[PDB]
Design a protein around this ligand. Sequence first.
Ligand SMILES: Nc1ncnc2c1ncn2[C@@H]1O[C@H](COP(=O)(O)OP(=O)(O)O)[C@@H](O)[C@H]1O
Ligand SMILES: Nc1ncnc2c1ncn2[C@@H]1O[C@H](COP(=O)(O)OP(=O)(O)O)[C@@H](O)[C@H]1O
Ligand SMILES: Nc1ncnc2c1ncn2[C@@H]1O[C@H](COP(=O)(O)OP(=O)(O)O)[C@@H](O)[C@H]1O
Ligand SMILES: [Mg+2]
Ligand SMILES: [Mg+2]
Ligand SMILES: [Mg+2]
Lengths: 366, 366, 366, 393, 57
Amino acid sequence: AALVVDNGSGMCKAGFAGDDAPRAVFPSIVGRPRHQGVMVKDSYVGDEAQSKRGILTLKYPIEHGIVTNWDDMEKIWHHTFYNELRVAPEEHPVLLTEAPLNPKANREKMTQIMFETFNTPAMYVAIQAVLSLYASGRTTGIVMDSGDGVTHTVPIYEGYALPHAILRLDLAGRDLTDYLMKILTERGYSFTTTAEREIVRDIKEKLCYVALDFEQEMATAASSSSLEKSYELPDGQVITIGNERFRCPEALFQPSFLGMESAGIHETTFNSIMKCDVDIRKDLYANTVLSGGTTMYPGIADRMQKEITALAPSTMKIKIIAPPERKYSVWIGGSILASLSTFQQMWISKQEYDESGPSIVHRKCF
Amino acid sequence: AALVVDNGSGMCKAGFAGDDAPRAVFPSIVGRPRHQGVMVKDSYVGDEAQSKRGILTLKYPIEHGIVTNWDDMEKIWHHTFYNELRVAPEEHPVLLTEAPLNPKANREKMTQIMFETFNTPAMYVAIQAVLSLYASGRTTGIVMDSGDGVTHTVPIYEGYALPHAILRLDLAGRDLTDYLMKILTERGYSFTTTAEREIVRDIKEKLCYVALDFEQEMATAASSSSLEKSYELPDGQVITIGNERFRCPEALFQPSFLGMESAGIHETTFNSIMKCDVDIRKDLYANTVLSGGTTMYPGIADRMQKEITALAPSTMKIKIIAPPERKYSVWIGGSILASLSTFQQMWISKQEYDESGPSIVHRKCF
Amino acid sequence: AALVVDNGSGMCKAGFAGDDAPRAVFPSIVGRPRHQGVMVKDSYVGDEAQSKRGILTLKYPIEHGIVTNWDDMEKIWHHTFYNELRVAPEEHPVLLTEAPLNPKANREKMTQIMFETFNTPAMYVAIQAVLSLYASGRTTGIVMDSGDGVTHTVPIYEGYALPHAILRLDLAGRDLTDYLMKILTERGYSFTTTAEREIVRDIKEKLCYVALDFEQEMATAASSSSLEKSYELPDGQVITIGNERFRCPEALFQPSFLGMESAGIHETTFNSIMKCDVDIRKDLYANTVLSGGTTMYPGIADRMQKEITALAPSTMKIKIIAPPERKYSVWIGGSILASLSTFQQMWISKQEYDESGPSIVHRKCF
Amino acid sequence: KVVRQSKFRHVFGQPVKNDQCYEDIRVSRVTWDSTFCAVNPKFLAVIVEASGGGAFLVLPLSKTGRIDKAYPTVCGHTGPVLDIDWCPHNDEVIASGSEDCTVMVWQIPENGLTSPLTEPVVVLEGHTKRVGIIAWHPTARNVLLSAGCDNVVLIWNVGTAEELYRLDSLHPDLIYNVSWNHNGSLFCSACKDKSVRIIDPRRGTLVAEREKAHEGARPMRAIFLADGKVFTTGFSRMSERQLALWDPENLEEPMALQELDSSNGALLPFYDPDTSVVYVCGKGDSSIRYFEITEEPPYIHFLNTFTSKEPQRGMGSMPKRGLEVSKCEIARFYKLHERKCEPIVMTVPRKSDLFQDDLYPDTAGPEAALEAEEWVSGRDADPILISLREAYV
Amino acid sequence: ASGGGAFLVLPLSKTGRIDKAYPTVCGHTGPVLDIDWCPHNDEVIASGSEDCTVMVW
Ligand SMILES: Nc1ncnc2c1ncn2[C@@H]1O[C@H](COP(=O)(O)OP(=O)(O)O)[C@@H](O)[C@H]1O
Ligand SMILES: Nc1ncnc2c1ncn2[C@@H]1O[C@H](COP(=O)(O)OP(=O)(O)O)[C@@H](O)[C@H]1O
Ligand SMILES: Nc1ncnc2c1ncn2[C@@H]1O[C@H](COP(=O)(O)OP(=O)(O)O)[C@@H](O)[C@H]1O
Ligand SMILES: [Mg+2]
Ligand SMILES: [Mg+2]
Ligand SMILES: [Mg+2]
């Protein structure tokens, strides 16, 4: 019974190998009380923190795909094994996921905690981008992984990755949530505290969408009310948003909205494929696979295809692969890979690490 | 056995810890003679002042929850221990109550009085708002204590208070007693003395009620004698009142009747909830608790629920909790608190105070 | 003879271009009677409302930099043109100031009312933050703007603004004034009516100051009477305040005093600088400019400098610019800008607006 | 009678001002659960992260404020440093153990470090695995105890660089922590087998052993008390953190057993023999809990708790000699964040501004009672006590 | 209205709080300036907006 744990910047997905969906999906947040109790637990992790977020100060242990504080990070893992999965970590091998171009120091800390703090029998860590292609059942393609912390573009050809062509874009869902926060002020709605941030994130996940033509959508919203949508706040208040539904996701293609000099995802995909060899660009053009929760905006694939087609040569066949379950593509691929018979030799034993150290972890891993 | 003493602005309640009802309840009143003796005591307290009020001038030692005379207040306590509970103060630990956001200097004054002038062995102070929630068996909710001197609205969520959202209304039953005295003159009845004022209070506690619809009640009272009631004065004179039964309690919802531009009591609760976090307003709406002797008017809960519902969003469930014993929630909750085995830790001994002083008193305040 | 109008949350400043100081400065309030006239004007605006505030209900048409009532707001402008300035709005161009990141709809309503109601010949809208830098005679620097409703931090480099780095703080003079009431009640002084709010504001503007060391000031204030000051009420009563002089301004540095989850003013300024490019943080640290009436507290600049120094790297040279006339920096900068020869092309004519609409106003303005 | 008689029931914690802290410190990121900090009344030592090998930063106490990133450090180990300990009889001497299976002892200059320190005074190579436990002998001079991951306990004479004693066949699993007794004659050890062992080093015999002291599999600690008892902090079968008191003459059942919470993180206890107060801090916890140990049942009385909003990475305790006696301060705690060290002052509220004799009984001085050769013979002596009255101002 | 123009038409009996998502008469491409009920038809109303059109409902 191998455990597949996919820890992201904002979301954490966990479950058992062979399953078709993660069993535990809870926010990766740690909350602490900001007031003094008057009726006679100093921290809350996951859904309980979300349920009590009114009196708590929510903090993300991972920021931009970087562990800003490992002490809360261990709490997330401890909450996963004992409070979410309700299993003993020492009895199940654990499959881990790493961001592309993960620092060796980051992997070492992840490895050391797993074998020492939790005393896992065996464990392995795999690239999130590679696992996403496993779920799609493809051996060649370029996957853009846009989650909560950072967006990555990793091209893979015939099972070979190209690290030199891997591009990083410091722009993800959390930045959108902040962008939705700032643009909601012009409509008269004020959200400042960390508790309000989750509320704004819920609105983003429910009412935001990607417009095929941003300029035409702006004209439509300025001359009609058909794009208005209403959201009910937890206190029973209702708010209405218009152009902000498609303005917030537009930062994906126009980072200058956030003041970022970097280019959009559509171009960032184009530079990445432009960086690899000429003979493999054909397969990557027709094998663009979308992964991450930030890719659930409706119509993002259609806008994706139109943008790259303008950049790509006219003779070139552009195919954007957006499976409906790509939010858990990293976890789904991990469960598939862990269920393979030929994966048993990639496992790293606790005794082996105790005598060899993290050197064996840098090897056998990419 | 500990002592639970609640020296409210107009009503003083006390009794042994663990009892279901306070042992002694007497008015917080100090009377002094106003006529010359002609036959062969400078002050009286409570009942011994009440039974002799015909020849005495009555003074409340506390106004709007502010101590006006410490010496009379000390006399109140001295009468309380020896004449009401009839026990030695040094033989029992005492649990004491204070108004929300009570000034620390005021909290220090009674601390000095207890340990020095009464030589109490142990002592603790608790907020009256929290004690009410203890009686209701709740950890989350907004409690509305309307006493004789002042009214407060204290929201509590999961045992955590929000001092910034605490609102105070300078209106309570004593102001209503003056208003009833004012609105009884037009009916032809004159009451001016403090002894007469207490008579008005008895009429207020017996024949007043909160009308669900004030204007319709005005229309009904002006066209029928059904609402008419008769009160007998101590001299046997029968006093008949009509619309004043519900006109006086209307002052809580319409403070403009007293010339006060402050909002209605119902609105004060709404603003207190509005001042708190968005995510915890749902629990507060369904956990509104009425406390204090002012909240004994019949039909006040129904008028409360109707008014706030008109202010809250329609999707919110409004629940008003008005236990029949809520006249003594502060004392009853204290009896529960002092009965808890875990309560023994936050006791403060006389020796500790004598060597440390005020600092240990303001600290340990839960 | 252009007109310079600087409308804020609590203060409204008006005058003529080229003048060193505003000619008319009056409170931005609208008063209405709350009693019944018995002796044989339904609203009062500005100073006349202040003089008659004893029988009026004072309301601010702007709350947190948001116009809560445009009808009362038009009264402010009408009182400004005809009563205060005593000039014809249709004969002089008007320069208007708007808060940073002003919503488009808010400018349109301001634009519409000038051209259609007052029929001004020419009009222009400028950023309040930019005008403050105009008065300081600087082209590069971050300006913090704390007024009555909202505190803003705007960095400007070589005439270029960075909207993504603009930070907003919902804490200003009105919030401090309300906090003063809450702690003044602890001293036994009861201020509840809207008329007393101006009185509390007057005490704040006269006796409040920023302590360099907040905890040290408590220790001095708790062991001496040197920090004690007396204020005379309009009815001749004299009140005495101690530590409250510097406790109220501390909320700017410690928003937790008001229960706010946001950071203090110094960190917000620091965070705004950190959001900018690395190469431009050199000049912003040495060009911090204070503006708004909330920056008039004695010692606020030194406490500003000490706090930011602890956050910035030791190699960073910090300069806090607090000109003595910074209470009118927005108006003064507007007067200089309106007097520039190269400014006449910024004007927008009423005829052009009639044939084009507010589209020409969104462009040519930032 | 209503209130249990105590002098520390109202002790409150207060962090020092911002300018009095130490920032810009890259604290070590090693999963080993040690104090990560050693402080003496002259210097502050904190384990830091180095790209190559291991190092710990030693700075004077007066050097507050921001710390230069290029500040010289004690970088002598070829592997990451696991733990550090100041010499009680020499404030300028600190021992360090690292992952390079060696122990090196350093001599700090009086004014601090002007250049990075690489060469140590004495190197101890007796462990086949990483050494994460070091403990100076409370009384005997130049005596150091080292316990590596090889389940081997060694006694070293740093003055002569000689391994005095070797204890190997005594710990079947990994050892958590080791603490000397009052006179230095005995030491207690916590092992991964949930067994608490009291061992005589000079004789190499197991004095007492309690198996399955805590049923949880999480790491657990064990310390000696001044009166001669053992305080163990461990976990239950339901993963609940517990505090236990043990009598070395009777270990069949603990004297007390209280459960604190179900939170994770090992509980590091800090004992104050003068006040008989143990401060319990947990790794990654934002609160510090202190308890009083007395003969009255239940022998473990919870006093109060200082609560913060930030988890700590390690903990260092200031001995009595460096405390501000005039301010009625009984303990100082250097809370370590991920990039900052925040001293915390533990203060007894007292009205009188004069010296409090009861709060400050005679404390062990910085002079060793015996020497290594004398202690080897079997001599036993209590630590020499000094008077804190002179520190009053 | 965020885009175009509309006016709210509700029954007289429909009192109290009206939900924010109540359907409105949103046909004009510009904000509505004036509205007038037909005196001879209680179910007919004409509206004028900034789109230079008069539109009868
Ligand atoms: N339906 C949705 N629409 C838009 N964004 C979404 C949706 N669901 C999730 N997200 C965004 O995806 C982000 C996290 O996605 P994911 O990659 O699955 O987890 P992580 O990034 O933590 O690994 C969140 O920040 C959230 O804002
Ligand atoms: N049955 C009743 N009906 C109406 N008013 C009442 C009733 N009982 C008490 N009151 C009024 O409530 C007021 C406050 O009571 P209480 O809350 O006990 O005062 P406090 O708590 O401030 O001592 C009293 O002045 C009394 O006149
Ligand atoms: N001398 C002073 N000391 C403290 N606060 C002041 C002083 N003068 C003005 N203020 C505060 O400044 C606030 C408004 O300042 P200003 O920015 O000029 O007005 P507005 O916010 O309307 O633009 C007022 O709320 C007032 O309390
Ligand atoms: Mg992810
Ligand atoms: Mg009361
Ligand atoms: Mg202003």
